[PDB]
């Protein structure tokens, strides 16, 4: 689902 993994918190 995430597309920009580094933005995950």
């Amino acid at each position, epitope marked *: 689902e995430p597309q920009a993994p*580094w933005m995950e918190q």
Partner: antibody
Amino acid sequence: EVKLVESEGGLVQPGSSMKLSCTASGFTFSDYYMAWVRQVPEKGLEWVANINYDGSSTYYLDSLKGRFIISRDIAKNILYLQMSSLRCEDTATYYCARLTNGYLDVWGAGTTVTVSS
Amino acid sequence: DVVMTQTPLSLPVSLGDQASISCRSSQSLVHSNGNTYLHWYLQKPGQSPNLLIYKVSNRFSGVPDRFSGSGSGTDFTLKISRVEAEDLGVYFCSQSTHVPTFGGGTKLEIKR
């Protein structure tokens, strides 16, 4: 077919502004995150910015100090990069790219921006 | 600030032989969600980069099985078997587990 085409780049005076655009085709535009990256001469590739499906969430390379704005027009299948207060160090080849599951799976042709008086 | 270090800077290979390129990251690329966001791109002369391998070992559409990606954690390798002349160009790795960064590239040179 899938394709990304950047607008013409070119010369801008230091301290001035400019906007790049990128037009997408072949896929459902709003079904994908999008990104800009740049290739600085004698240096490597560097992330610039990315944007989620509807444009409610963006990410920027920190060093940009909020001088750049990434945005997208769903009605027109267009991605923008607004660049303000340009300095010599912003001189580079800018690429727009489609972002999927953390990777860039479609790249544009690149457009060259030169900051100079 | 995650550094991607590629070696060698340039790699000469004979047609039909194998090329092996190393990419190392300064931090583990295993995301908290379990995925390793390490990818490989190829930029041919006069062209934009194209995706070759995503998430360590997955070949992107149209990439032949000659191209193989491997590794884990901080240590990764791209192997190109049976090299063809059209494979030449700059191979670079990239990570997006963390704030995204790119390796400096490895130039594949064809021997003749």
